[PDB]
Amino acid sequence: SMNPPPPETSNPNKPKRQTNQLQYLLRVVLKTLWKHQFAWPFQQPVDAVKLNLPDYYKIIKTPMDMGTIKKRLENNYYWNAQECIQDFNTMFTNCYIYNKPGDDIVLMAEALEKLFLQKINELPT
Ligand SMILES: O=C(Nc1cc(-c2csc(=O)[nH]2)cc(S(=O)(=O)NC2CCCC2)c1)C1CC1
């Protein structure tokens, strides 16, 4: 397929954890970003067949999206907040990598990344 399987949202080999910061990442950070007007391209894995981006996964080797992040948070997949934050950063950087400066999709990611940074500036103790 043009599409690889989506990133795992569970892994029985990997230990689970719940922290105040991870709870906040789901309840506040993810769920607020999700409602932003520019969130829609990032709410699910890129479907290269649907979107006619046959080279997407030829270029992007560590795909990530907020649908996956949401499911990971719901499943207590992450060890800590930093691990989850890394997934958001991978999502943004993928967008900058696959596209180019000034593209509409990049303007969208830029705005979401700013809002994301505002929200993770302070996490609960
Ligand atoms: O996701 C959707 N559409 C969609 C997503 C992308 C995209 C997500 S991550 C990335 O790098 N690109 C891109 C497109 S596009 O080819 O049609 N370009 C558009 C997107 C915004 C500005 C130009 C579409 C719908 C939710 C499933």
UniProtKB/Swiss-Prot annotation:
Compartment(s) where it occurs, according to its Swiss-Prot or TrEMBL record: Nucleus; Chromosome
Cross-link (Glycyl lysine isopeptide (Lys-Gly) (interchain with G-Cter in SUMO2)): 58
Site residues, Acetylated histone binding: 99
Post-translational modification: Phosphorylation by CK2 disrupt the intramolecular binding between the bromo domain 2 and the NPS region and promotes binding between the NPS and the BID regions, leading to activate the protein and promote binding to acetylated histones. In absence of phosphorylation, BRD4 does not localize to p53/TP53 target gene promoters, phosphorylation promoting recruitment to p53/TP53 target promoters.
Residue ranges of domain Bromo in the record: 17-123
Chain segments annotated as transmembrane: none
Taxonomic superkingdom: Eukaryota
Tissue-level expression: Ubiquitously expressed.
Main function: Chromatin reader protein that recognizes and binds acetylated histones and plays a key role in transmission of epigenetic memory across cell divisions and transcription regulation. Remains associated with acetylated chromatin throughout the entire cell cycle and provides epigenetic memory for postmitotic G1 gene transcription by preserving acetylated chromatin status and maintaining high-order chromatin structure. During interphase, plays a key role in regulating the transcription of signal-inducible genes by associating with the P-TEFb complex and recruiting it to promoters.
Binding partners and assembly: Interacts with p53/TP53; the interaction is direct. Interacts (via CTD region) with CDK9 and CCNT1, acting as an associated component of P-TEFb complex. Interacts with RELA (when acetylated at 'Lys-310'). Interacts (via NET domain) with NSD3, CHD4, BICRA and ATAD5. The interaction with BICRA bridges BRD4 to the GBAF complex. Interacts (via NET domain) with JMJD6 (via JmjC and N-terminal domains); the interaction is stronger in presence of ssRNA and recruits JMJD6 on distal enhancers. Interacts with NSD3. Interacts with NIPBL. (Microbial infection) Interacts with bovine papillomavirus type 1 regulatory protein E2. This interactions may serve for the tethering of viral genomes to host mitotic chromosomes allowing successful partitioning of the viral genome during cell division.
Family that this chain belongs to: Belongs to the BET family.
Disease cited in the entry: Cornelia de Lange syndrome 6: A form of Cornelia de Lange syndrome, a clinically heterogeneous developmental disorder associated with malformations affecting multiple systems. It is characterized by facial dysmorphisms, abnormal hands and feet, growth delay, cognitive retardation, hirsutism, gastroesophageal dysfunction and cardiac, ophthalmologic and genitourinary anomalies. CDLS6 inheritance is autosomal dominant.
Domain remarks in the Swiss-Prot or TrEMBL record: The NET domain mediates interaction with a number of chromatin proteins involved in transcription regulation (NSD3, JMJD6, CHD4, GLTSCR1 and ATAD5). The C-terminal (CTD) region mediates interaction and recruitment of CDK9 and CCNT1 subunits of the P-TEFb complex. It is also required for maintenance of higher-order chromatin structure.
Miscellaneous comment as given in the Swiss-Prot or TrEMBL entry: JQ1, a thieno-triazolo-1,4-diazepine derivative, and I-BET, a benzodiazepine derivative, have been tested on tumors with success. Treatment with GSK1210151A (I-BET151, a I-BET derivative) has strong effets on mixed lineage leukemia and promotes myeloid differentiation and leukemia stem-cell depletion.
Name listed for the protein in its UniProt record: Bromodomain-containing protein 4
Originating species: Homo sapiens (Human)
Span covered, complete protein: 44 to 166 of 1362
